[PDB]
């Protein structure tokens, strides 16, 4: 069960250096011993090996320069979880400290002087070209511009922000997964030996999907740190890149002044479910390393990330005890909705890409939609959409392009609820769409009601006093080999009850919360084209979204900010539950 991982993109691979990741509860003594064991064993087989660095703090492991001939030997070592081959990364009031993992910085620029501390940490790969020389260049450009966008006196977002620079990218704007890893461990170690102040980390870089890079980011995110990353500048799915694909980091895509996704020559901003929101990223004025008072116009998803890192720094200077779930939820809440022209993205990626452009703010119920990865085409294939640890799964829906679905289930998986969608017989696959919320003093629970083919017992609701229905899931409970007959809808008596087929099990989210009040909204169209919509009003927050009828006329349904969207084929009704606190 000790696995080897390498970058999917061959030209970004760096064979010869490997991150050996050990099992969770491994002390520094065991990491050193395991690295020494590998050195000795390699020496016995006649190979020189260099232990570049030993990881302690963020995750247990070590960095080793060795021939790939010795991999098979290293996989057999004791305590090894996995070995990942190194690969390259590329450049793309209270006191809040903002860490920046990027190039060098011109710290004496008027735009950022006195607000930027150069940490002395430096870990970069050597430049390509036998005769490459920086000459008059100080390799400050990218980092200086970004430090300016985050906190520059005149052109910055958070003009009251302390910054800390780590050099993780060389003159050519190239870094490695291993150098970033060391940079993150430096930050964790700083945080351990330094304050209980709010930390923001800006990762304006991207590489191919990396298991260890995402693991280290998750561990920093769970330690309280707020990670903001660039989505990537490859006009591709950001789930194929790291730290972009890490679910805990805030992944920012780029938009221009005409609310269009940014184009960078033949490529452009990355997209998909792993992007959290978009931010201004084309023709961005910021500090230039050319002179101490110069400005320059740069474009890309690092520019976009730096706006969000600035916004996060301002929100944190006001509310320093704010958690990462609260911060992410607040970011999504204050952004401009439906402004971006989705035409530029691939058609199958549009649904999955948020239509959100960051903005500053000008107790409360916050929700956000979380799409799963597509399931396999197997008939018993499932998609799983998970919320962040501090959030509540308030509803769960599913969507298939073919429309062949068994429905979905809100079930516990490791003590937390997840939204698990199920593919049907003959179906291509499905997505699970969770609705993750931050509800003040919630005691929420899901209750499963069985299929109701009898004349009574059909109404499913939160029968408990003080508990209110926030969302319904429906899962088709007829075996695939069974005689298929057209589904029958459960009659409608009360307004606040789950809508569903008599042949389906119903999962009902019931919340008991101090000022929580929750209502239902419907909207039907007889013969619609493409879709049906019903939206909550100002003040109300969408918590559930369901379609009516089933597979026959529907592809699925999903939340789009505070709009419930049902996708039809060529009496479709969108049922929404709107919810609010105090």
């Amino acid at each position: 069960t000790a696995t080897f991982h390498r970058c999917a993109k061959d030209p970004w691979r760096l064979p010869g250096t490997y991150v050996v990741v050990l099992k969770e509860e491994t002390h520094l003594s065991q990491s050193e011993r395991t690295a020494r064991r590998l050195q000795a064993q390699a020496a016995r087989r006649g190979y020189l090996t260099k232990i570049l660095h030993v990881f302690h703090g963020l995750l247990p492991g070590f960095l080793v320069k060795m021939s790939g001939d010795l991999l098979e030997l290293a996989l057999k070592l004791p305590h090894v979880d996995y070995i990942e081959e190194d690969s390259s990364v590329f450049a793309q009031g209270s006191l809040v400290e903002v860490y920046l993992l990027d190039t060098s910085i011109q710290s004496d620029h008027r735009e950022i002087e006195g607000r930027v501390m150069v940490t002395d940490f430096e870990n970069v790969p050597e430049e390509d070209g036998t005769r490459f020389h920086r000459q008059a260049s100080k390799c400050d450009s990218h980092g200086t511009h970004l430090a300016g966008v985050v906190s520059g006196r005149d052109a910055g977002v958070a003009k009251g922000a302390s910054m800390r620079s780590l050099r993780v990218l060389n003159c050519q704007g190239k870094g490695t997964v291993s150098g970033t890893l060391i940079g993150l461990e430096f930050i964790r170690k700083s945080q351990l030996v330094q304050p209980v102040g709010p930390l923001v980390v800006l990762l304006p870089l991207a590489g191919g999907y990396s298991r260890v890079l995402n693991a280290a980011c998750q561990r920093l995110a769970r330690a309280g740190v707020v990670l903001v990353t660039a989505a990537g500048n490859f006009r591709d799915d950001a789930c194929l890149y790291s730290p972009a694909s890490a679910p805990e980091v805030i992944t920012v895509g780029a938009t221009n002044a005409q609310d269009q996704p940014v184009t960078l020559g033949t490529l452009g901003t990355n997209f998909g479910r792993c992007v959290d929101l978009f931010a201004p990223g084309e023709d961005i004025i910021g500090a230039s390393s050319d002179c101490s008072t110069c400005f320059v116009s740069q474009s890309g998803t690092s520019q976009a990330a730096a706006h969000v890192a600035g916004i996060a720094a301002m929100m944190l200077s006001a509310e320093p005890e704010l958690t990462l779930a609260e911060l992410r939820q607040r970011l999504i809440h204050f952004s401009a909705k439906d402004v971006i022209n989705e035409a530029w993205f691939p058609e199958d990626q549009r649904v999955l890409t948020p239509n959100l452009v960051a903005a500053l703010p000008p107790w409360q119920l916050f929700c956000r939609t979380v799409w799963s990865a597509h399931s396999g085409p197997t008939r018993m294939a499932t998609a799983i959409a998970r919320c962040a640890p501090d959030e509540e799964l308030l509803s769960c829906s599913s969507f298939s392009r073919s429309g062949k679905r068994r429905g979905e289930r809100m079930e516990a998986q490791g003590g937390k609820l997840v939204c698990r969608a199920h593919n049907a017989f003959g179906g291509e696959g499905v997505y699970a769409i969770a609705r993750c919320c931050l509800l003040p003093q919630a005691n929420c629970s899901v209750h499963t009601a069985p299929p109701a083919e009898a004349s009574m017992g059909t109404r499913v609701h939160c029968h408990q006093q003080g508990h209110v229905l926030t969302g319904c899931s429906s899962h088709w409970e007829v075996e695939d080999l069974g005689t298929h007959k057209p589904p029958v809808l459960r009659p409608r008596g009360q307004p606040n009850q789950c809508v569903g087929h008599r042949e389906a099990s119903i999962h009902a989210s019931c919340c008991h919360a101090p000022g929580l009040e929750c209502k239902v909204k419907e909207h039907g169209i007889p013969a619609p084209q493409e879709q049906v919509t019903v939206a909550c009003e100002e003040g109300w927050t969408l918590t559930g979204c369901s379609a009516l009828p089933g597979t026959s006329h529907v592809l699925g349904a999903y939340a789009v900010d505070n709009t419930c969207v049902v996708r039809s084929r060529e009496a479709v009704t969108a049922v929404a539950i709107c919810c609010r606190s105090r």
Binding site: A155, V157, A257, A279, P280, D283, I284, I285, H307, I311, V357, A358, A359, L360, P362
Partner: peptide
């Protein structure tokens, strides 16, 4: 400066 107006920083 459009970007700073877009995020609602400048009028």
């Amino acid at each position: 400066x459009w970007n700073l107006k877009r995020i609602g920083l400048l009028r």
